[PDB]
């Protein structure tokens, strides 16, 4: 019921299983030999994504958990220009 | 229906708490995953211990203040209590 | 100056001498010669100021121009305004074509241009033959001009005189020992054009010169051309050439009767049976060396008939108008083959007559076979597919059932016609590329109308499956119009030009069923036009959302479900939500806007103008190009 | 002007209105030629009246001409009267809802799919923000129409 995402610098980020299942590559990484069904971590060892990019990805996970079909107008998701061009590559890689 | 963030020095937890709910429920749901008793764990938000059974106004976060894109930065204090050494995320490279 | 050139144009238009003198004097030498040696663009077509003197018969204003100046007639100008408006002709060319002999003789005496050679090497004698004035033709020959000038398609001056009603020009041309067997592009030696307009005296004039009979490229004798044109006056005229035999004697009456059976101007069913019975009686008149009619295989187009090998069966269908027209179509196809230009025009006329009589299945069969014949002949059949579109429109509108194999056959024929239209577009560079693109857009529109008819037709599962396969093939070819609209763009755009017939009553664009069908068949839902607008960029640009909310909701639901990116960007940098221009399309788009972190990050990259070159995957480079 | 607008005589209405005709003349039932024109449904006549600024006012039965157009199951005049820049969201939503209502029970114009789609359009425009929302003034249930209590959510719709 919890995922233990880690970055390339070792910064662990823990989100809910349903929060991280929105990404396609996260669901792909968990299913398989990387399952490790001890019901504790189900950790994911990212090799290239930095810590701030994963923080923004988990923020987007919570943002999509909140607003998935809530009315029509959605609150804005501000993205820093410096964190962009790295969040885009992560979102392509995460199939988010 | 506000989502909160609890930051340790390395790990980071994303949880949920209802607007018409107290700290008891969020303490229970963070105890259920971090296997730490409620007396041992302390929500050291904004460098200040807050409560154990009081509302969120004195805690310092509301639903409108803690957005999904920018959640709270509530710290975590564990009994060895301990010292705060939460490092920031990795800075983006080659600032434009 | 251009303003001074227009001043002398109006003076020469009214034929005033004193007004032109004051507007072409008291100046230098450079500007005066330029005014008399430059054309003026009036009404969208350029013309020499000396042309309007000859066109209006103002010989007085142009005769004194040659006295006081040295203006020549070598100025390049157009030929005529009767659907040609092509330049290259000299100023003397229009003098003969204006019907004014007084202006022809003055230009000849001062720098004659009777041997003018344009891009079409059209001599002024060609316009003289078209105008039909004997004095102009007679005087031009006396000015040492050759009369045997052949154009790129061998346009002999006797052919245009024989084709037209000017019998005085053609009889003068043969008096100077002209070539009667002038081979043309189509192999017509100045007799097929003569026996095409029913000129009783023109064809007889060339009988004296003994122009003989030669088979052209299409396998048609000049006698057969007269029989094809429903001109019975010249059919009997060519029978007295002393070389006709019996193979071409009876079949002349068969072709004349068949042409009389199905013709717009000359429709005579009483003469149809009489010419067919006379031809039938001539075959069976001796009992020896008989020439039976050759038996073609039975054709599903013309009912179930197998020609008429006896005079008795022709008598039994004398009072039946429907049987006589169908009988004449078989023998006309038999004589002329399947390679004639006008082999399907009687078929089209019969189909139109039957369609005007609330009959449609015979029209469908005849037009399908004519379309097969024309497509096998490498002809432009976009008009035939258009006619198919209107006939299916009347079939749908009058609550009549539409055959599914027939609509599948016309759909695959339209797909093929798209294929050769693209082939002609990619082959011809600039000779007829504009007309090719126009006909290509036209037959693309006909394919859209046929798809709309198929959606509005209840058919079987297998028929719908093969129709979907054909549409799948055509979309996989991906034809694009001038502005880059695909099939999905045209089926969505409200500005799609619908035909001015009852197809507008049936086929209305945008159509929810057509767009749903194209996506199910498989279409590039993210395809862009020249402006970069996608399929979603046009449905949100719809101007009347409330009136047909059933259509606008179904298209937007189908588009987003099929995989259209609801964040795209045209060359004007505007999202489909930014092109909604209404309070309804924005609501329907926003409630179907699925969120993606790849979309938000790329949108922030584009907004912040961050240099993304060689920093992201090449596939992602296309993704950020519009997100 | 009204009796010319009731039938296909847009030329007569035009020749009247570029001769300083009545822009705001009422009638016995308070019809300012727009209640009397939307029932006919001639879209060009309503175009001419909007171009000459015939304005919008309730008739003697308390019905705006937009509601008269919505009652007659005529979507084109409904759209044209909606494009007026002064109708406001409340009247726009109730007009769309009334049009969807009228499409459900009518002899000549009966489309239940159009009924559902127009009701969905009315509900989506209601529940689109979450702030300054326009909740329905839901009447108590009436035994004649079963026991339904309208549709205050898109989920039940």
DSSP sequence for C231-246: -HHHHHHGGGSS--TT
> Who's near C180: CB < 8 A, 6+ residues apart?
C174, C189, C190, C206, C209, C210, C211, C212
Q: Look-up: residue for tokens 């000849």?
A: C108
H/E element holding B75?
A: strand B74-77
CA D99: distance to chain centroid? 7
Q: Is B3 helix (H, G, I), strand (E, B) or coil?
A: strand
Give A-chain residues touching D128 at CB under 8 angstroms.
Answer: 71-73
* Distance in angstroms (rounded) separating the CA atoms of residues C139 and C129: 12
**Which pairs from B13-18 meet CB under 8 Å and 24+ separation?**
B13/A14, B14/A14, B14/A15, B14/A16, B14/A19, B14/A58, B14/A61, B14/A62, B14/B71, B17/B56
A69 contacts chain D (CB < 8 A): no
Nearest chain D alpha carbon to A73:
D129
> Who's near C13: CB < 8 A, 6+ residues apart?
C52, C53, C56, C58
* Distance in angstroms (rounded) separating the CA atoms of residues C472 and C524: 11
* Distance in angstroms (rounded) separating the CA atoms of residues C48 and C52: 7
Q: Is A92 in contact with C600 (Cβ distance < 8 A)?
A: no
Measured in degrees and rounded to the nearest 5, phi and psi for residue A2 equal -150, 145
Q: Is A91 in contact with C597 (Cβ distance < 8 A)?
A: yes
Q: For residues C370-406, b (16+ Cβ closer than 10 Å) or e, as one string?
A: bbbbbbeeebbbbebbbbbbbbbbbbbeeeeebbbeb
B33 contacts chain A (CB < 8 A): yes
A9 contacts chain B (CB < 8 A): yes
Give A-chain residues touching B67 at CB under 8 angstroms.
Answer: 75
A10 contacts chain B (CB < 8 A): yes
Q: Look-up: residue for tokens 């004097």?
A: C25
Q: Is B4 helix (H, G, I), strand (E, B) or coil?
A: strand
Can you read off the two tokens belonging to residue C331?
């023998």
The DSSP letter of residue D151 is -
Give C-chain residues touching A60 at CB under 8 angstroms.
Answer: 597, 600
Q: For residues B43-62, b (16+ Cβ closer than 10 Å) or e, as one string?
A: bbbeeeebeeeeebeebebe
Give the 3-state secondary structure of C604-622.
HHHHHCCCCCCCCCHHHHH
Q: For residues B74-94, b (16+ Cβ closer than 10 Å) or e, as one string?
A: bbbeeeeeeeeeeeebbebee
Q: Is D75 in contact with C548 (Cβ distance < 8 A)?
A: yes
- Which among C591, C610, C617 has CB closest to A84? C610
Nearest chain C alpha carbon to A85:
C605
Q: Is C601 in contact with A67 (Cβ distance < 8 A)?
A: no
- What are the angstrom distances between the C-alpha of C582 and each of C1, C192, C545? 52, 63, 8
Give the closest residue to C389 by CA, choosing from C373, C369, C411.
Answer: C411
Contact C39, C47 (CB under 8 A): yes
* Distance in angstroms (rounded) separating the CA atoms of residues D112 and C464: 27
DSSP symbols for A10-21? --EEEEEHHHHT
Q: Is A73 in contact with D130 (Cβ distance < 8 A)?
A: yes
- What are the angstrom distances between the C-alpha of D53 and each of C237, C416, D21? 75, 54, 11
Q: Is D113 in contact with C550 (Cβ distance < 8 A)?
A: yes
Contact C506, C456 (CB under 8 A): yes
Give the closest residue to C191 by CA, choosing from C219, C164, C213, C166.
Answer: C213
H/E element holding A44?
A: strand A44-45
Residues β-bridged to residue B43: B76
* Distance in angstroms (rounded) separating the CA atoms of residues B88 and D151: 50
Q: Is C391 helix (H, G, I), strand (E, B) or coil?
A: helix
Nearest chain C alpha carbon to D118:
C549
Measured in degrees and rounded to the nearest 5, phi and psi for residue B74 equal -65, 125
D130 contacts chain A (CB < 8 A): yes
H/E element holding C47?
A: strand C45-47
Give the closest residue to D133 by CA, choosing from D122, D121, D125, D141.
Answer: D125
Nearest chain B alpha carbon to A20:
B14
Q: Is B69 in contact with A7 (Cβ distance < 8 A)?
A: no
Can you read off the two tokens belonging to residue C439?
């006909």
> Resolution reached, in Å?
3.6
- What are the angstrom distances between the C-alpha of C490 and each of C280, C475, C602, D72? 54, 13, 29, 33
Can you read off the two tokens belonging to residue B44?
């050291």
Give the closest residue to A87 by CA, choosing from C575, C593, B69, B10.
Answer: B69
Give C-chain residues touching A81 at CB under 8 angstroms.
Answer: 604, 608, 610
Contact C513, C452 (CB under 8 A): yes
Contact C377, C339 (CB under 8 A): yes
Residue range A17-93, CATH number: 3.30.710.10
Contact D52, D24 (CB under 8 A): no
* Distance in angstroms (rounded) separating the CA atoms of residues C400 and C458: 11
Q: Look-up: residue for tokens 């939500």?
A: C577
H/E element holding A4?
A: strand A2-6
Side-chain-side CA neighbours of residue A18 (13 Å): 6
Contact D38, D49 (CB under 8 A): no
The DSSP letter of residue D143 is G
Q: Look-up: residue for tokens 């479900």?
A: C561
DSSP symbols for D37-73? HHTTT-HHHHHHHHHTT------TTS--HHHHHHHTT
- Which among A2, A14, A62 has CB closest to B3? A62
Residues 28-67 of A with CB under 8 A from C: 57, 60, 64, 67
A71 contacts chain D (CB < 8 A): yes
Q: Are strands A2-6 and A44-45 parallel, antiparallel or unpaired?
A: parallel
Measured in degrees and rounded to the nearest 5, phi and psi for residue C285 equal -135, -10
Q: Is C308 helix (H, G, I), strand (E, B) or coil?
A: coil
A73 contacts chain D (CB < 8 A): yes
Interface probe with B: pick from A55, A70, A76, A83, most Cβ of B within 10 Å:
A55
- What are the angstrom distances between the C-alpha of B9 and each of A46, B15, B87, C148, C241? 19, 17, 6, 103, 114
* Distance in angstroms (rounded) separating the CA atoms of residues C40 and C6: 7
Give the 3-state secondary structure of C148-208.
CCCCCCCCCHHHHHHHCCCHHHHHHHHHHCCCCCCCCCCCCCCCCCHHHCCCHHHHHHHHH
Contact D101, D95 (CB under 8 A): no
Query: C touches D (3+ CB pairs < 8 Å)?
Result: yes
Interface probe with A: pick from D130, D132, D155, most Cβ of A within 10 Å:
D130
Can you read off the two tokens belonging to residue C555?
């298209």
> Who's near C441: CB < 8 A, 6+ residues apart?
C481, C482
* Distance in angstroms (rounded) separating the CA atoms of residues A15 and B47: 24
Chains touching D by CB (3 or more pairs below 8 Å): A, C
Can you read off the two tokens belonging to residue B92?
């983006």
Chains touching B by CB (3 or more pairs below 8 Å): A
Contact C493, C538 (CB under 8 A): yes
How was this model experimentally determined? Answer: cryo-EM
Can you read off the two tokens belonging to residue C419?
């294929």
Cis omega (within 30 of 0) for bond into C102 = no
H/E element holding D14?
A: helix D10-17
Give the closest residue to C626 by CA, choosing from C486, C483, C522, C527.
Answer: C527
Give D-chain residues touching A72 at CB under 8 angstroms.
Answer: 124, 127-129
Binding-site residues of D for Zn(2+): 28-29, 61
D154/chain A closest Cα distance in angstroms: 10
Chains touching C by CB (3 or more pairs below 8 Å): A, D
* Distance in angstroms (rounded) separating the CA atoms of residues D26 and D28: 7
D146 contacts chain A (CB < 8 A): no
* Distance in angstroms (rounded) separating the CA atoms of residues C293 and C283: 8
C589 contacts chain A (CB < 8 A): no
> Who's near C254: CB < 8 A, 6+ residues apart?
C275, C276, C279, C331, C332, C335
- What are the angstrom distances between the C-alpha of B87 and each of A10, A43, A75, B12? 12, 21, 29, 12
Give the closest residue to C597 by CA, choosing from A52, A84, D62.
Answer: A84
Binding-site residues of C for Zn(2+): 185-186, 218
Can you read off the two tokens belonging to residue D43?
């879209």
């Amino acid at each position: 019921m919890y995922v233990k995402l880690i970055s390339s610098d070792g910064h662990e980020f823990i989100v809910k299983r349903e929060h991280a299942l929105t990404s396609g590559t996260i669901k792909a990484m968990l299913s398989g030999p990387g399952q490790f069904a001890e019901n504790e971590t189900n950790e994911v060892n990212f090799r290239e994504i930095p810590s701030h990019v994963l923080s923004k990805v988990c923020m987007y996970f919570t943002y999509k958990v909140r607003y998935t079909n809530s009315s029509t107008e959605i609150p804005e998701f501000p993205i820093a220009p410096e964190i962009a061009l790295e969040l885009l590559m992560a979102a392509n890689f995460l199939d988010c | 229906d506000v989502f909160l963030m609890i930051r340790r020095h390395k790990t980071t937890i994303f949880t949920d708490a209802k607007e018409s709910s107290t700290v008891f429920e969020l303490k229970r749901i963070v105890e259920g995953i971090l296997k730490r008793p409620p007396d041992e764990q302390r929500l050291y938000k904004d460098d200040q211990l807050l409560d154990d059974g009081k509302t969120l106004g004195e805690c310092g976060f509301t639903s409108q203040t803690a957005r999904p894109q920018a959640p709270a930065t509530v710290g975590l204090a564990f009994r060895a209590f301990e010292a705060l050494c939460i490092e920031p995320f990795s800075s983006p490279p080659e600032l434009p | 100056m251009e303003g001074l050139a227009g001043y002398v144009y109006k003076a020469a238009s009214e034929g005033k001498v004193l007004t032109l003198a004051a507007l072409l004097l008291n100046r230098s030498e450079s500007d005066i010669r330029y005014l008399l040696g430059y054309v003026s663009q009036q009404g969208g077509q350029r013309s020499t100021p000396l042309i309007i003197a000859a066109r209006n018969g103002h010989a007085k204003v142009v005769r004194l121009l040659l006295e006081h100046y040295r203006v020549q007639t070598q100025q390049t100008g157009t030929v005529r305004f009767d659907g040609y408006v092509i330049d290259g002709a000299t100023a003397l060319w229009c003098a003969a074509g204006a019907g004014h002999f007084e202006v022809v003789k003055l230009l000849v005496s001062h720098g004659a241009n009777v041997n003018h050679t344009t891009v079409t090497n059209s001599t002024p004698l060609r316009a003289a033959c078209f105008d039909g004035r004997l004095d102009i033709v007679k005087y031009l020959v006396e000015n040492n001009a050759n009369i045997s000038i052949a154009n790129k398609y061998d346009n002999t001056c006797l052919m245009i005189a024989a084709y037209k009603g000017h019998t005085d020009v053609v009889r003068y041309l043969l008096e100077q020992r002209a070539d009667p067997n002038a081979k043309a592009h189509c192999g017509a030696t100045a007799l097929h054009f003569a026996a095409e307009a029913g000129h009783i005296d023109i064809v007889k004039e060339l009988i004296k010169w003994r122009a003989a009979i030669v088979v052209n490229g299409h396998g048609m004798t000049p006698l057969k051309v007269a029989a094809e044109s429903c001109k019975a006056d010249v059919v009997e005229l060519l029978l007295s050439h002393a070389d006709c035999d019996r193979r071409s004697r009876i079949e002349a009456l068969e072709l004349l009767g068949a042409s009389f059976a199905n013709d717009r101007e000359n429709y005579d069913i009483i003469k149809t049976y009489h010419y067919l019975y006379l031809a039938m009686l001539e075959r069976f008149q001796d009992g020896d060396n008989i020439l039976e009619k050759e038996v073609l295989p039975p054709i599903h187009a013309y009912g179930n008939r197998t020609e008429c090998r006896n005079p008795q069966e022709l008598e039994s269908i004398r009072q039946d108008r429907d049987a006589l027209h169908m009988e004449g179509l078989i023998v006309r196809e038999r004589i002329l083959g399947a390679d004639n230009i006008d082999v399907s025009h009687p078929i089209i006329y019969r189909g139109a007559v039957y369609a005007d009589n609330m009959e449609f299945e015979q029209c469908i069969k005849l037009w399908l076979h004519a379309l097969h014949l024309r497509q096998k002949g490498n002809r432009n059949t976009h008009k035939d597919l258009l006619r198919f579109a209107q006939v299916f429109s009347q079939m749908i509108h009058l609550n009549e059932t539409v055959k599914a194999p027939d609509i599948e056959c016309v759909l695959r024929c339209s797909v093929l016609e798209i294929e050769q239209s693209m082939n002609r577009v990619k082959n011809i560079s600039d000779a007829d590329v504009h007309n090719a693109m126009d006909n290509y857009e036209c037959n693309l529109y006909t394919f859209l109308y046929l798809v709309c008819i198929s959606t509005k037709t209840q058919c079987s599962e297998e028929d719908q499956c093969k129709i979907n396969k054909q549409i799948y093939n055509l979309i996989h070819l991906d034809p694009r119009t001038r502005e880059g609209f695909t099939l999905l763009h045209l089926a969505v755009n409200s500005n799609t030009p619908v035909d001015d017939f009852h197809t507008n009553d049936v086929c209305s664009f945008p159509n929810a069923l057509v767009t749903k069908l194209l996506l199910d068949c498989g279409a590039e839902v993210n395809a862009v036009d020249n402006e970069g607008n996608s399929a979603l960029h046009i449905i949100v640009q719809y101007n009347r959302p409330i009136s047909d909310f059933l259509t606008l909701h179904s298209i937007i639901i189908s588009l987003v479900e099929a995989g259209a990116h609801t964040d795209m960007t045209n060359k004007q940098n505007k999202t489909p939500l930014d092109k909604s221009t209404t309070g309804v399309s924005e609501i329907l788009l926003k409630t179907q806007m699925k969120m993606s972190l790849k979309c938000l990050a790329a949108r922030a990259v584009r907004a912040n103008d961050i240099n993304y070159q060689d920093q992201i995957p090449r596939t992602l480079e296309e993704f950020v190009g519009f997100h």
